[PDB]
């Protein structure tokens, strides 16, 4: 459960697509933590 707030990564719903790499999870099972390349 990482907020990804320090990394500045954006959270994505369901799962992280290819444009964004899923580092783990935004915080809840509703969305996932994603980061722009």
mmCIF file of N, CA and C in Angstrom:
data_model
loop_
_atom_site.group_PDB
_atom_site.id
_atom_site.type_symbol
_atom_site.label_atom_id
_atom_site.label_comp_id
_atom_site.label_asym_id
_atom_site.label_seq_id
_atom_site.Cartn_x
_atom_site.Cartn_y
_atom_site.Cartn_z
ATOM 1 N N UNK A 1 0.849 -1.221 0.000
ATOM 2 C CA UNK A 1 0.000 0.000 0.000
ATOM 3 C C UNK A 1 0.874 1.258 0.000
ATOM 4 N N UNK A 2 1.212 1.755 -1.158
ATOM 5 C CA UNK A 2 2.061 2.979 -1.226
ATOM 6 C C UNK A 2 1.266 4.129 -1.852
ATOM 7 N N UNK A 3 1.244 5.267 -1.214
ATOM 8 C CA UNK A 3 0.479 6.421 -1.773
ATOM 9 C C UNK A 3 1.151 6.946 -3.046
ATOM 10 N N UNK A 4 2.404 6.635 -3.243
ATOM 11 C CA UNK A 4 3.110 7.121 -4.463
ATOM 12 C C UNK A 4 3.032 8.648 -4.549
ATOM 13 N N UNK A 5 2.817 9.307 -3.444
ATOM 14 C CA UNK A 5 2.733 10.796 -3.470
ATOM 15 C C UNK A 5 4.129 11.403 -3.620
ATOM 16 N N UNK A 6 5.104 10.826 -2.977
ATOM 17 C CA UNK A 6 6.488 11.367 -3.079
ATOM 18 C C UNK A 6 7.039 11.149 -4.489
ATOM 19 N N UNK A 7 6.795 10.001 -5.055
ATOM 20 C CA UNK A 7 7.302 9.724 -6.430
ATOM 21 C C UNK A 7 6.549 10.576 -7.457
ATOM 22 N N UNK A 8 5.387 11.057 -7.107
ATOM 23 C CA UNK A 8 4.609 11.897 -8.062
ATOM 24 C C UNK A 8 3.903 10.999 -9.081
ATOM 25 N N UNK A 9 3.962 9.708 -8.895
ATOM 26 C CA UNK A 9 3.291 8.786 -9.856
ATOM 27 C C UNK A 9 1.771 8.919 -9.741
ATOM 28 N N UNK A 10 1.064 8.741 -10.825
ATOM 29 C CA UNK A 10 -0.422 8.858 -10.772
ATOM 30 C C UNK A 10 -1.049 7.480 -10.543
ATOM 31 N N UNK A 11 -2.200 7.438 -9.928
ATOM 32 C CA UNK A 11 -2.862 6.128 -9.672
ATOM 33 C C UNK A 11 -3.800 5.769 -10.828
ATOM 34 N N UNK A 12 -3.867 4.514 -11.182
ATOM 35 C CA UNK A 12 -4.768 4.101 -12.299
ATOM 36 C C UNK A 12 -5.801 3.094 -11.791
ATOM 37 N N UNK A 13 -6.996 3.220 -12.300
ATOM 38 C CA UNK A 13 -8.100 2.317 -11.892
ATOM 39 C C UNK A 13 -7.890 0.909 -12.458
ATOM 40 N N UNK A 14 -8.465 -0.078 -11.827
ATOM 41 C CA UNK A 14 -8.314 -1.477 -12.321
ATOM 42 C C UNK A 14 -6.835 -1.884 -12.353
ATOM 43 N N UNK A 15 -6.174 -1.729 -13.470
ATOM 44 C CA UNK A 15 -4.737 -2.118 -13.540
ATOM 45 C C UNK A 15 -3.935 -1.084 -14.337
ATOM 46 N N UNK A 16 -2.640 -1.078 -14.178
ATOM 47 C CA UNK A 16 -1.796 -0.101 -14.927
ATOM 48 C C UNK A 16 -1.561 -0.600 -16.356
ATOM 49 N N UNK A 17 -1.851 0.249 -17.305
ATOM 50 C CA UNK A 17 -1.666 -0.113 -18.732
ATOM 51 C C UNK A 17 -0.180 -0.149 -19.085
ATOM 52 N N UNK A 18 0.129 -0.101 -20.348
ATOM 53 C CA UNK A 18 1.561 -0.130 -20.769
ATOM 54 C C UNK A 18 2.165 1.268 -20.640
ATOM 55 N N UNK A 19 1.391 2.274 -20.932
ATOM 56 C CA UNK A 19 1.905 3.669 -20.823
ATOM 57 C C UNK A 19 2.368 3.944 -19.392
ATOM 58 N N UNK A 20 1.791 3.266 -18.436
ATOM 59 C CA UNK A 20 2.194 3.485 -17.018
ATOM 60 C C UNK A 20 2.704 2.179 -16.403
ATOM 61 N N UNK A 21 3.757 2.243 -15.635
ATOM 62 C CA UNK A 21 4.291 1.003 -15.003
ATOM 63 C C UNK A 21 3.726 0.856 -13.588
ATOM 64 N N UNK A 22 3.101 -0.253 -13.308
ATOM 65 C CA UNK A 22 2.508 -0.459 -11.955
ATOM 66 C C UNK A 22 3.598 -0.753 -10.919
ATOM 67 N N UNK A 23 3.906 0.198 -10.081
ATOM 68 C CA UNK A 23 4.948 -0.038 -9.043
ATOM 69 C C UNK A 23 4.376 -0.921 -7.932
ATOM 70 N N UNK A 24 3.090 -0.850 -7.717
ATOM 71 C CA UNK A 24 2.458 -1.681 -6.654
ATOM 72 C C UNK A 24 0.968 -1.343 -6.564
ATOM 73 N N UNK A 25 0.602 -0.452 -5.683
ATOM 74 C CA UNK A 25 -0.837 -0.077 -5.552
ATOM 75 C C UNK A 25 -0.965 1.332 -4.963
ATOM 76 N N UNK A 26 -1.861 2.126 -5.487
ATOM 77 C CA UNK A 26 -2.038 3.510 -4.958
ATOM 78 C C UNK A 26 -2.281 3.469 -3.451
ATOM 79 N N UNK A 27 -3.205 2.659 -3.029
ATOM 80 C CA UNK A 27 -3.505 2.558 -1.574
ATOM 81 C C UNK A 27 -4.679 1.600 -1.367
ATOM 82 N N UNK A 28 -5.710 1.734 -2.156
ATOM 83 C CA UNK A 28 -6.885 0.832 -2.011
ATOM 84 C C UNK A 28 -6.976 -0.106 -3.217
ATOM 85 N N UNK A 29 -7.764 -1.135 -3.070
ATOM 86 C CA UNK A 29 -7.939 -2.120 -4.164
ATOM 87 C C UNK A 29 -8.781 -1.519 -5.292
ATOM 88 N N UNK A 30 -9.253 -0.316 -5.116
ATOM 89 C CA UNK A 30 -10.076 0.320 -6.179
ATOM 90 C C UNK A 30 -9.163 0.825 -7.298
ATOM 91 N N UNK A 31 -8.069 1.443 -6.948
ATOM 92 C CA UNK A 31 -7.137 1.960 -7.992
ATOM 93 C C UNK A 31 -5.725 1.414 -7.768
ATOM 94 N N UNK A 32 -4.869 1.553 -8.742
ATOM 95 C CA UNK A 32 -3.475 1.047 -8.591
ATOM 96 C C UNK A 32 -2.479 2.189 -8.817
ATOM 97 N N UNK A 33 -1.353 2.150 -8.161
ATOM 98 C CA UNK A 33 -0.352 3.241 -8.339
ATOM 99 C C UNK A 33 0.335 3.116 -9.700
ATOM 100 N N UNK A 34 0.351 4.175 -10.462
ATOM 101 C CA UNK A 34 1.007 4.124 -11.799
ATOM 102 C C UNK A 34 2.003 5.276 -11.937
ATOM 103 N N UNK A 35 3.001 5.116 -12.761
ATOM 104 C CA UNK A 35 4.001 6.207 -12.935
ATOM 105 C C UNK A 35 4.266 6.451 -14.423
ATOM 106 N N UNK A 36 4.372 7.689 -14.818
ATOM 107 C CA UNK A 36 4.629 7.995 -16.256
ATOM 108 C C UNK A 36 6.104 7.765 -16.592
ATOM 109 N N UNK A 37 6.331 7.275 -17.779
ATOM 110 C CA UNK A 37 7.714 7.003 -18.241
ATOM 111 C C UNK A 37 8.448 8.314 -18.538
#
